[PDB]
Amino acid sequence: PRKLVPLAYKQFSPNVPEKTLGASGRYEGKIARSSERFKELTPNYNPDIIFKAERLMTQRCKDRLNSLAISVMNQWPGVKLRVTEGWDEDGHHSEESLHYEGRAVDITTSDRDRNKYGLLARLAVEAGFDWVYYESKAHVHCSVKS
Numbered sequence: 001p002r003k004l005v006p007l008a009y010k011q012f013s014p015n016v017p018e019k020t021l022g023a024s025g026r027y028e029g030k031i032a033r034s035s036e037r038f039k040e041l042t043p044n045y046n047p048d049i050i051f052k053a054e055r056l057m058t059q060r061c062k063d064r065l066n067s068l069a070i071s072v073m074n075q076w077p078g079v080k081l082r083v084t085e086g087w088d089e090d091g092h093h094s095e096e097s098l099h100y101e102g103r104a105v106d107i108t109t110s111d112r113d114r115n116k117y118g119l120l121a122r123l124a125v126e127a128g129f130d131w132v133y134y135e136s137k138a139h140v141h142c143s144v145k146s
């Protein structure tokens with residue numbers, strides 16, 4: 001067994017830029033409702049995840065999130081994974097955010113205990129998200145390749 005080490009504030013894993021090939025890969029452009037690429041987005045209705053649209057994400061993102069949902073409930077009995085941002089149609093992030101193509105989620109615990117977020121980030125990496133960034137005290141940013 002291995003010690004699960006929480007990510008530090010502002011740490012990202014792996015320790016490379018999000019868009020690198022060993023991470024979540026290149027930005028592919030915004031996905032609009034009208035896009036053909038919009039049909040690669042699937043809604044996530046996992047009853048074990050709290051959703052603050054936020055539900056629309058790629059299959060790989062869905063798989064990683066659902067895996068995380070289990071691990072969080074294990075880590076903290078009685079607590080659930082919570083999503084506060086998923087697919088963004090409204091330019092609320094940087095120039096080229098993976099949020100714009102349904103390949104990123106910002107997450108917390110259901111109890112909004114910010115002291116848990118570093119460990120939540122570690123669980124996200126263990127759950128297979130291709131890039132995990134303890135971006136803010138308000139949430140952890142998790143993304144996947146396409």
Ligand SMILES: [Zn+2]
Nearest residue numbers: 104105106141
């Ligand atoms: Zn984010």
